[PDB]
């Protein structure tokens, strides 16, 4: 079992400039606006279809999520596989406030039913199940509609889809507990706490039958009995209602019998204090999970106590006399963080929970409540909010730096930038759906207008102008960061039971959780949780495991003291091709120069406890290495058509490529700290802590390898953060024409989709090239059995590692540079091949071919020669190509280049001959007799001199240069020339020919 302890957050960037076209629907129930009603905090949740783990089902990789604030509901359907058309709805129930946790989705074999609870009305929507919308397997991926396409046709005013809650017995005021479900007969039921402390159950008739809504009140009652959290479980004809109330007691209700069957005091399991029994439990929550394969129902309950929370998981046990009891499985404590939501899965037996720390930061953890020997919560590495201050170098212009930070992939959402703009202009102008480029130009123009308005005098100093620029852009950035902070608030968690797909639902965007690799897990886990890492997972050698742990500790002690200046110096050294070894040495000298807190002595002490530090270095540099061998077998074209759409949506591309980005960033940091630590071990090896031969190995093989890995991860990081440029269609078509000449365009032009979204060059490569090879990665892993369910963790790990192997620019197919010559982004191409070529050894010939094409396009044909020839006699072949071009003109150049080609000629005498013929022809047409003759004698063909000479004499007799003809010294074939002339002249007539004369 791969104990994937730590997870990392991948932001599923909603980078589409056009807001998902939220089909605004306003529902007007006959209820008056209550001025002064309770304000409910924003909530969210998700629903995952059944059979979503199946590879052949039509709900594969599909899930619904929704956010609900005061009187609005925003439903969205997402598919990691294919982009869904019309996959967003904004339902506005006017005068009614949607409850926290009052939206429940229930599934039927034909429909998807959404049950919405409000403070005054209850609703029911009916949408077609995805397996029923599509009757034909031949559907282009471009038009697969979401189930929200036909929500405008459902009558929301139908009294069977809308009911108003009466005031008596009515619902309790200020209560958020609510549950709803579909019975076995199809009836929609809505439960909620009554004013009298019980449960109020409002039952609707089935959607296809006429009937009257029925209202029932379950009663066992002061405000102490008021349910805080409600959950339901349907058992074969009945709906078991569970009530976790204010008085710290869980109550199980039967709706069919309308009787409470179990009463359980929640305080018998907590380390009771006398004060709790007198305080109402307003913070408790309740979640139920059912294991069909075992027939077991698990109860995960959270107990909010002002001093310490507690997670308690229970198993429901039914005695033979229909007496139900709870069995204690586990009790887990938590810290003083304020819980927001929590779900627990029955496939992995994990409790996923989301908190907020005392700094209001997002904290997510997960724990296995069956194998919990240590009471430790495994961390989730949540992406931090952007930094408050942006450091600007004195050589860097503030405009470019601030634009690059604001518009960097994954930092800021479109809504935050748009809101900052809206407030900066103080205008109520309708914000169109502005593209990212138009949004950038709008930001630039607005802050430039603010700058020009901040400049009052005409004689401003250049330093003063720079300061005003920095100030204005910093104000804009601070507003953007405020609104990104508001849009990044956590709301709830959505975990998938079958695919283990975990998602974190934020107010403004969706973020996916992915399993973290061992290197990054050890590097990023806090110091307090590193001393408890199970050393069996790292290696079978306990000693090697302890070595790697101590090494990672020191790696962090170096990182905890690298200021922003040293990190920027290393990044600049990587940019300007400086040697990162000497740069790491300089950073080490500055660190030892600033060792105020004796951190260096501690690093020495901790390296002393390491037995084989070089073995740990070699282990780290092996796990961080994706240098593949050339055994990437090419795809056989018999892949089943059903796999071509796997992970093909913009969301899946963005998530995988953010995985690449975060992995490259973390491992870049690791290789930087590792280079610093290696120079440290060099400086320390002199005082006999490492042997002479070991030190020789470290300085000869390990430091250049770490430097190459660091340059490689900087390369992949830059590639994952560099934005692709918009290429018009005319230029792309002229380009694909230019390459049909070179025969690199095998793939038919199958309507290249308008990429109206922002995509990095890594994302463009993923969508065009790396995604077509995922079927074979799936097939090669022993997945010939089509019955295995899709696993999010394993699939994302394999996909990220394969995309890193391709993005470790070693891909023998070599389609990134072939494409960047195919597109007209020759720029990122020359940069890619340049930053790439020194250190990666596969595709050297292909890199050189593509660099030659870039130089051919830039107008530099001789360097195209050199790079075509390193790419591959081939030199002679390119010489022949260049000779064709010079001959098209009409030929001293042609002569000279052909002469160089003679020296290089080892294979094509035929090509030599044709070029010589062309030279002779040109010269004769121009009038150069002698040069033509020389080109002629050189021709390696058997009898061209003869034919060429016939041509010569005919052309000459016509040009009438007969004195020159008389003077020409005929060769040994003098008698031959004379004879030919005579023959021809006597054969032809006398009137039209003066050849006798």
């Amino acid at each position: 079992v791969n104990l994937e302890r730590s997870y990392m957050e991948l932001i599923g960037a909603e980078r589409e400039t056009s807001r998902r076209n939220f089909r605004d629907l306003s529902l007007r129930p006959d209820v008056n606006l209550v001025i002064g009603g309770p304000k409910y905090a924003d909530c969210a949740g998700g629903y995952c279809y059944s059979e979503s783990s199946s590879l052949l089902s039509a709900t594969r990789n599909r899930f619904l999520h929704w956010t609900s604030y005061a009187d609005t509901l925003e439903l969205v359907e997402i598919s990691l596989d294919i982009n869904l058309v019309n996959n967003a709805v904004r339902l506005r129930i006017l005068n009614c406030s949607i409850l926290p946790g009052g939206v429940h989705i229930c599934e039927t074999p034909n429909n998807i039913v959404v049950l919405i609870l409000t403070n005054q009305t209850v609703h029911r929507l009916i949408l077609p199940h995805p397996s029923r919308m599509y009757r034909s397997e031949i559907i282009s991926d471009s038009h697969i509609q979401s189930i929200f396409t036909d929500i405008g046709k459902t009558n929301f005013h139908d009294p069977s889809n809308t009911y108003v809650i009466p005031a008596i017995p009515g619902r309790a005021p200020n209560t958020t507990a609510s549950t709803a479900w579909l019975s076995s007969d199809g009836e929609a039921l809505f439960a909620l706490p009554s004013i009298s402390g019980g449960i109020l159950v409002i039952k609707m008739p089935p959607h296809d039958m006429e009937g009257l809504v029925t209202i029932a009140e379950l009663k066992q009652q002061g405000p102490a009995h008021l349910p805080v959290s409600l959950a339901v479980h349907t058992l074969d004809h009945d709906s078991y209602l569970f009530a976790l109330c204010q008085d710290h007691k869980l109550r199980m209700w039967s709706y069919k019998d309308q009787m409470c069957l179990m009463v359980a005091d929640m305080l018998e399991y907590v380390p009771v204090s006398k004060d709790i029994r007198q305080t109402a439990g307003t913070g408790h929550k309740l979640r139920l999970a059912f294991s069909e394969t075992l027939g077991i129902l698990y109860l995960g309950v959270y107990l909010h106590t002002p001093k310490q929370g507690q997670f308690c998981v229970f198993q429901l046990m039914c005695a033979e006399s229909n007496r139900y009891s709870l069995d204690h499985i586990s009790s887990i404590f938590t810290n003083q963080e304020t819980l927001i939501d929590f779900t627990f899965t029955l496939t992995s037996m994990d409790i996923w929970a989301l908190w907020l720390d005392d700094d209001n930061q997002t904290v997510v953890k997960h724990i296995n409540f069956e194998e919990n020997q240590a009471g430790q919560w495994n961390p989730v590495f949540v992406n931090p909010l952007p930094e408050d201050d942006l450091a600007i170098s004195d050589e860097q212009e503030p405009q470019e730096a601030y634009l690059e930070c604001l518009f960097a992939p994954g930092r800021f959402t479109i809504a935050a930038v748009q809101k900052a703009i809206q407030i900066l202009r103080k205008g109520s102008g309708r914000v169109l759906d502005l593209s990212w480029e138009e949004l950038r130009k709008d930001v630039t123009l607005t802050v430039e207008n603010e700058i020009q308005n901040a400049v009052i005098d005409y004689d401003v100093s250049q330093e003063e102008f720079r300061q005003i620029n920095i100030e204005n852009w910093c104000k804009f950035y601070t507003c953007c960061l405020q609104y990104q902070e508001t849009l990044s608030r956590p709301l709830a968690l959505l975990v998938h039971p079958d695919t283990n797909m975990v998602c974190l639902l934020r107010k403004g965007f969706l973020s996916f959780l992915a399993p973290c690799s061992l290197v990054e897990h050890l590097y990023l886990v806090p110091a307090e949780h590193l001393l408890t890492v199970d050393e069996s997972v790292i290696s079978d050698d306990i000693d090697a495991a302890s070595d790697i742990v101590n090494l990672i500790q020191c790696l962090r002690m170096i990182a905890d003291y690298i200021s922003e200046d040293m990190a920027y110096l290393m990044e600049s050294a990587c940019c300007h091709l400086q040697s990162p070894e000497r740069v790491a040495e300089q950073i080490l000298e500055d660190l030892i120069a600033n060792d105020i807190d004796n951190i260096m002595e501690n690093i020495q002490n901790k390296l002393q406890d390491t037995r084989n530090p070089i073995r740990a270095i070699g282990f780290l540099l092996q796990n961080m290495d994706y240098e593949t061998n050339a055994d990437m077998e090419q795809p056989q074209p018999n892949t089943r058509l059903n796999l071509s759409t796997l992970y093909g949506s913009i969301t899946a591309s963005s998530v995988v490529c953010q995985a690449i980005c975060k992995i490259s960033a973390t491992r870049f940091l690791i290789c930087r700290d590792l280079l610093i630590l290696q120079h440290l071990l060099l400086r320390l090896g002199d005082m006999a802590l490492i042997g002479a031969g070991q030190l020789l190995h470290s300085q000869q093989e390990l430091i250049p390898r770490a430097a190459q890995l660091l340059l490689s991860y900087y390369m992949i990081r830059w590639g994952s953060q560099c934005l692709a440029c918009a290429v018009p269609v005319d230029i792309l078509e002229s380009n694909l024409q230019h390459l049909s000449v070179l025969e690199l365009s095998d793939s038919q032009v199958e309507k290249r989709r308008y990429t109206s979204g922002i995509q990095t060059i890594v994302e463009l490569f993923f969508e065009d090239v790396a995604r077509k090879h995922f079927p074979h990665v799936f097939i090669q892993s022993g997945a010939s059995q089509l019955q295995e369910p899709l696993n999010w963790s394993d699939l994302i790990k394999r996909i990220t590692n394969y995309l890193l192997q391709l993005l470790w620019p070693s891909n023998p197919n070599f389609q990134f540079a072939e494409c960047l010559m195919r597109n007209c982004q020759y720029t990122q191409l020359q940069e890619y091949v340049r930053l790439l070529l020194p250190w990666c050894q596969v595709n050297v010939g292909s890199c050189h071919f593509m660099l030659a094409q870039c130089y051919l396009v830039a107008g530099e044909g001789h360097k195209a020669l050199d790079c075509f020839s390193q790419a591959a006699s081939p030199r002679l072949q390119y010489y022949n190509r260049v000779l064709r071009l010079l001959e098209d003109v009409g030929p001293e150049l042609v002569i000279q280049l052909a002469t160089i080609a003679i020296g290089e000629a080892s294979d094509d005498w035929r090509s030599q001959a044709a070029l010589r013929t062309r030279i002779f022809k040109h010269h004769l047409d121009m009038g150069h007799n002698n040069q033509a003759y020389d080109a002629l004698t050189q021709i390696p063909d058997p009898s061209r001199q003869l034919d060429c000479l016939r041509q010569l004499v005919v052309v000459l007799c016509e040009r009438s240069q007969l004195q020159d003809l008389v003077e020409f010294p005929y060769v040994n074939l003098h008698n031959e020339v004379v004879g030919i002339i005579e023959s021809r002249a006597r054969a032809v007539d006398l009137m039209t020919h003066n050849y006798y004369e």
């Binding site: 212009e397 470019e400 720029t827 360097k863 009409g890």
Partner: protein, 326 residues
């Protein structure tokens, strides 16, 4: 189907080798003829051109090669120095060239036996264009595929380096306003850098990519001309960063753009050397179609006469001159 009548070159001058780049002298040299430098496969030739439109004593064109400089590498871009003079008091010939070896070679001469050249190194990628970036001719600015615009003085030292986001494809000095250098990145972004603050003042964006050339209008320092993909683009500052005009220049990849030095409305763009003969299409701002279309069978390099309405395209062993009737 109107067949565009390819215009024959008004004057044709034979050379010794292929002309990879050709550049008139945009400054005053003190002579009656307008100097001309064209870089071959391995040389750099300086010539003096006198046309019939200047002197009625010249029948056609009078082409005299003044000096032949040995280069050793293919010349890809030539920049003239403002100190270039042919006066008999103290002649001084200075110019900067970039080659296929990523190095800059500052040639100095007095047209007598004194000939010196200096190699400046530091570019990690090929150089695409270079110009003299000071009115005194003291500094040299070059842009290339290492994503950098560097400022070299005459002694080979680097004064400043501005990091671009993409290969600079053309760099031009502001004709009147000092310390403003224009750098045309390939992905369409035109940047204006301030050589005293080492900061970027303003950026322009072309609607099409890639941006293969950019040039200032000497007669109207507000108009900027460029070629991006197939279409020529014109901006007018400080109005807006958006194009003012955008019309197709060539059927396949317009490459070079050069504003006329005598007319603020005429500019010539050369088609890319490829499947078709390299076409020159001289435009007029008032006309929707080119006023003159000539076919240079293989042509790289384009430069406009300082006084006449006459443009040159170095071809294959030939300099093709085209006169645009005003």
């Amino acid at each position: 189907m109107k067949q565009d009548s390819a215009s024959n070159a008004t004057y044709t001058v034979d050379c010794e080798d292929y002309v990879h780049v050709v550049e008139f002298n945009p400054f005053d040299s003190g002579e009656a003829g307008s100097l001309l430098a064209y870089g071959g496969i391995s040389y750099v030739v300086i010539a003096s051109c006198r046309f019939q439109e200047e002197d009625s004593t010249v029948e056609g064109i009078e082409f005299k090669t003044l000096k032949t400089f040995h280069h050793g590498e293919r010349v890809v871009a030539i920049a003239w120095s403002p100190e270039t003079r042919c006066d008999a008091l103290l002649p001084l010939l200075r110019f900067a060239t970039a080659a296929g070896d990523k190095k800059i070679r500052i040639f100095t001469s007095d047209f007598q036996d004194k000939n010196e050249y200096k190699v400046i190194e530091g570019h990690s990628g090929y150089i695409n264009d270079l110009v003299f970036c000071s009115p005194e001719g003291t500094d040299i600015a070059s842009v290339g595929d290492d994503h950098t615009c560097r400022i070299w003085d005459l002694d080979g030292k680097q004064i400043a380096m501005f990091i671009l986001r993409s290969p600079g494809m053309s760099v031009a000095w502001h004709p009147e306003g000092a310390f403003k250098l224009m750098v045309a990145e390939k992905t369409g972004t035109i940047r204006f850098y301030d050589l005293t603050t080492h900061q970027a003042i303003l950026s322009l964006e072309s609607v099409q990519v890639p941006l293969m050339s950019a040039d200032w209008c000497v007669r109207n320092t507000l108009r900027i001309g460029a070629v991006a993909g197939n279409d020529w683009i014109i901006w007018e500052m400080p109005r807006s960063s958006y194009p003012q005009d955008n019309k197709p220049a060539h059927a396949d990849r317009a490459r070079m753009f050069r504003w006329s030095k005598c007319n603020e409305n005429v500019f010539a763009t050369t088609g890319y050397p490829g499947k078709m003969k390299s076409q020159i299409a001289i435009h007029h701002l008032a006309h929707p179609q080119p006023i003159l279309i000539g076919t240079a069978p293989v042509g790289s390099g384009l430069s406009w006469h300082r006084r006449l309405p006459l443009c040159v395209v170095g071809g294959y062993r030939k300099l093709f001159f085209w006169l645009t009737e005003m």
